[PDB]
A paper describes a structure:
Omniligase-1 is a broadly applicable enzyme for peptide bond formation between an activated acyl donor peptide and a non-protected acyl acceptor peptide. The final omniligase variants appeared to have a very broad substrate range, coupling more than 250 peptides in a 400-member library of acyl acceptors, as indicated by a high-throughput FRET assay.
To examine the contribution of individual mutations on S/H ratio and substrate scope in peptide synthesis, we selected peptiligase variant [name]/[name] as a starting enzyme and introduced successive mutations. A Trp instead of a Phe at position 189 would be too close to this Asn (2.0 Å W189-CD1 to ND1 or OD1 of N109) which cannot adopt a different conformation because of steric hindrance. For instance, His217 is present in two distinct conformations, one pointing into the active site while in the other conformation the sidechain of His217 is facing the solvent.
Numbering used by the authors: 1 to 75, 85 to 278
């Protein structure tokens, strides 16, 4: 909203805005470090903390949750944000806390989960939680990871690496893969993730780079699509994003390409 960012244009969100679609009546769980709910540029509808040492989901001592929140609303100005705090100030959290956050999002009928986070290692418990959210009809979006490349090996973080999740990589303003953006066959789509200006705690603004801001754009895009097509299943929202992406190169690096929310929101299934 208040900090200008190229990313909103890049994914063609203004075309939805000009049609009157802004993500009205869409519940988006920001599963991250909290959201600074006292930021004048944010509104938070509810939330929960699962970080025993950081009990307030409506404060953010990391900054990532608040930056994600601002990007979600820049793309989908009318979206209802829920602050699901599973990470501490150092941007780390236990998988069990993450799972508790996912469980809360399912129980509270979230339309979209955004997981601005990933760990290097697998968990059947984490996989069961995202698979359950998808089975319950939630669109589950996650940052692909900031682990760069590892030759022919996947560097996609968990839970982005699970097939049920939409794994989002990062491009710059000229649609080139960001050097940090994780790669592999599990990568699904790309979005803007380089020098993204958004809300920071304490009524501040600033640029962040990562798959974290990239995932935020796709969570917002899912909210725009649901506002035009509130009857679409998560399966149909996901298909619309993947099948209408702008091809950018080899899928190992770029998945299906850059999301195009204008194209996605008029996809015929």
């Amino acid at each position: 909203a208040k900090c200008v960012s190229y990313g909103v244009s890049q994914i063609k969100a203004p075309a939805l805005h000009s049609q009157g679609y802004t993500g009205s009546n869409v519940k988006v769980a920001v599963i991250d470090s909290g959201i600074d709910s006292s930021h004048p540029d944010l509104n938070v509808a509810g939330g929960a903390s699962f970080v025993p040492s950081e009990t307030n989901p409506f404060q953010d001592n990391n900054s990532h949750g608040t930056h994600v929140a601002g990007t979600v609303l820049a793309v989908a100005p009318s979206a209802s944000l829920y602050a699901v705090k599973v990470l501490g100030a150092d941007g780390s959290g236990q998988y069990s806390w993450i799972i508790n956050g996912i469980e809360w999002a399912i129980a509270n009928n979230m339309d979209v989960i955004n997981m601005s986070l990933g760990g290097p290692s697998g968990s059947a418990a984490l996989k069961a939680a995202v698979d359950k959210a998808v089975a319950s009809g939630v669109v589950v979006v996650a940052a692909a990871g900031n682990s760069g490349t590892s030759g022919s090996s996947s560097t996609v973080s968990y839970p982005a690496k699970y097939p049920s999740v939409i794994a989002v990589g990062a491009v710059d303003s000229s649609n080139q893969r960001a050097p940090f953006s994780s790669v592999g066959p599990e990568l699904d789509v790309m979005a803007p993730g380089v020098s993204i200006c958004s809300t920071l705690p304490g009524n501040k603004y600033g640029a962040h780079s990562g798959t974290c801001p990239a995932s935020a754009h796709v969570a917002g895009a899912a909210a725009l699509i649901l506002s035009k097509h509130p009857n679409w299943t998560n399966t149909q929202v996901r298909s619309s994003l993947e099948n209408t992406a702008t091809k950018l190169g080899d899928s190992f690096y770029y998945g299906k390409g850059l999301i195009n929310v204008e194209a996605a929101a008029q996809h015929h299934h």
